[PDB]
Amino acid sequence: IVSVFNHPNITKITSGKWIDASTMKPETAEAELTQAIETIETITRGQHRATNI
Amino acid sequence: QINASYQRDMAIALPGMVADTSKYNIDGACVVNEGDVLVGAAVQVVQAQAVDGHKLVKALTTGTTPYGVAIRSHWQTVNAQNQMIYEDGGAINVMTSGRVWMLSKSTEAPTFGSAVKLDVDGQEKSDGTIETTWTYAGGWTKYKDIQLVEVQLHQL
Amino acid sequence: DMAIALPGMVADTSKYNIDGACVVNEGDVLVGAAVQVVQAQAVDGHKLVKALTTGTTPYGVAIRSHWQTVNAQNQMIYEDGGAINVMTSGRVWMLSKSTEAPTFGSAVKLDVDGQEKSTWTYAGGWTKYKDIQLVEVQLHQL
Amino acid sequence: LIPPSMRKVLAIRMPETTMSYLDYFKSQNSGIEIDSIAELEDIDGAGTKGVLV
């Protein structure tokens, strides 16, 4: 039985740590979220739009 | 926010597909013998029955004369190996006159009106050892990692 | 059962062409025999056909018809001075004098009577009916 | 008309303010519409992009 995190045909993005040694980076999170939304919009050619996070 | 619109084009052909509605001829009284036939590849005749009327065909082989090219059909073909094949012991749609899209394994586009050369396995190749009466019709395209060529077949 | 075929009868329903604007110039033509164009009128458009002779190029094969030609014999025949159907492209049964079937795809040769002796090609049909020995021939238009 | 991959450039927030370049451009040019077309992603057939006014 395959979990949602182990599906082999979904988009996966390796991310720089949002919290490294108790230091916060709130701009990296925003950049990555915008990039993920853009990827969802692009690869489906405007057929599906991201709704939940 | 700026609205966006996208665009995408379909492919032109599929292997074994009839090219256009010009004058053609299909020989449906054929039976596959000794093996499987790939759609879009040439076939040979091993025996023509003198009274019954059926013709026995199989895949092309070295030092043999090709007869025609099998075509697509959603009812007479079995889906095996993630594609359409004609299985052994079944009726086959063999075209002997007209324009058809055919499997190829060359690398350069052909010239219009030149003679067609085939490989041992029954696929078009620019330097094949099998001579054919057929000619090139000018179509040359590529499905997903598959090469295709437009060929004009004359009645044997 | 049934008989398999008759002379002069079309074999299949593939691409075929029939010239009905012809007439038998001289003599009689046997159904299922090759014919040649003696004279083609330039303006009138009719072709004068004849039975094949020595050293001539054949044109087509005469076919059967239950209305165009009647005859008191068992076998049909085209009378002199009548309109004739001649098929110039397709598969047709033909009279033959050979006794063994040739190879498929071979180029056939025609006798001096219009028969099949030992360019049109063999199609694969070789049957026997009342000691006639029909042969199936593919005709192209050149 | 602009390529759909250039919408991220015009959404950048201007330095030392809370308004973006697109909003300023629209304020200075009232009555002009901006749309995105995928056909502009490749005009010459070799990857060149283009903008149409």
Side-chain angles (χ1 to χ4, degrees), chain D residues 1 6-8 10 14 16 23 25 28-29 40 46:
Chain D
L1 302 171
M6 301 315 218
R7 289 174 303 155
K8 63 173 58 48
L10 294 173
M14 294 182 286
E16 301 96 321
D23 269 357
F25 188 93
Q28 303 264 280
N29 301 134
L40 290 173

Side-chain angles (χ1 to χ4, degrees), chain D residues 5-32:
Chain D
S5 68
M6 301 315 218
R7 289 174 303 155
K8 63 173 58 48
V9 179
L10 294 173
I12 304 191
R13 214 171 81 270
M14 294 182 286
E16 301 96 321
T17 189
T18 186
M19 182 179 72
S20 77
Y21 288 87
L22 179 63
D23 269 357
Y24 187 59
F25 188 93
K26 277 154 102 183
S27 69
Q28 303 264 280
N29 301 134
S30 178
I32 187 166

